[PDB]
Amino acid sequence: IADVVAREYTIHLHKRLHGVTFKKRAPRAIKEIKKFAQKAMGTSDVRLDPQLNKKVWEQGIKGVPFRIRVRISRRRNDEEGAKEKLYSYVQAVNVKNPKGLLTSVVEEE
């Protein structure tokens, strides 16, 4: 309901990247993460953390992990006459194992 809200998600990059060219898996993973955030928060303005880019390209151009655990935070873009009022920022989060984890909302307090 709230326009400003942050949640934690698990992305099955295995099913997103099945059959894709090895030499294009990682950029395809970045585009699939952008599409995932766009579908989840309904915002076309998605900004990725450079350390999330690190995590995607951790194992080379064709070693993208099967499941990635991310935090997507929808915030307000003030700017000056911006085309989109809200924007989603996606970060990589540090967990022991990105399996068996449900979708959880993270509280700012």
Partner RNA sequence: GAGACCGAUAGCGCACAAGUAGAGUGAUCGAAAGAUGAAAAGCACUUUGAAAAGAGGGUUAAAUAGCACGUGAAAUUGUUGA
Partner RNA sequence: UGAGCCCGGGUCGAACGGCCUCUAGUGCAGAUCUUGGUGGUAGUAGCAAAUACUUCAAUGAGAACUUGAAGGACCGAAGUG
Partner RNA sequence: CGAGAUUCCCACUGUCCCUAUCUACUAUCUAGCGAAACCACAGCCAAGGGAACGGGCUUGGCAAAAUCAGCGGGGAAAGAA
Partner RNA sequence: CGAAAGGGUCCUGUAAGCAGUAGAGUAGCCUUGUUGUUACGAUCUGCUGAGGGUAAGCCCUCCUUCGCCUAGAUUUC
Give the binding site for RNA (CB under 7 A): 1, 7, 9-12, 14-15, 18-19, 23, 26-27, 30, 36, 39-40, 42, 46-50, 52-54, 56-57, 60-61, 66-67, 98-105
Residue closer to RNA, measured from CB, 47 or 71 = 47
**CB of residue 47 to RNA, shortest distance in Å:** 4
Q: Output the furthest CA–CA distance in the chain (Å, rounded).
A: 43
Residue closer to RNA, measured from CB, 50 or 94 = 50
42-46, long-range: CB < 8 A, 24+ apart: 43/74, 43/84, 43/86, 43/87, 43/88, 44/84, 45/77, 45/84, 45/86, 45/87, 45/88, 46/87, 46/88, 46/89, 46/90
**CB of residue 90 to RNA, shortest distance in Å:** 9
Residue closer to RNA, measured from CB, 50 or 78 = 50
Which two three-digit tokens encode residue 97?
């194992």
**CB of residue 66 to RNA, shortest distance in Å:** 5
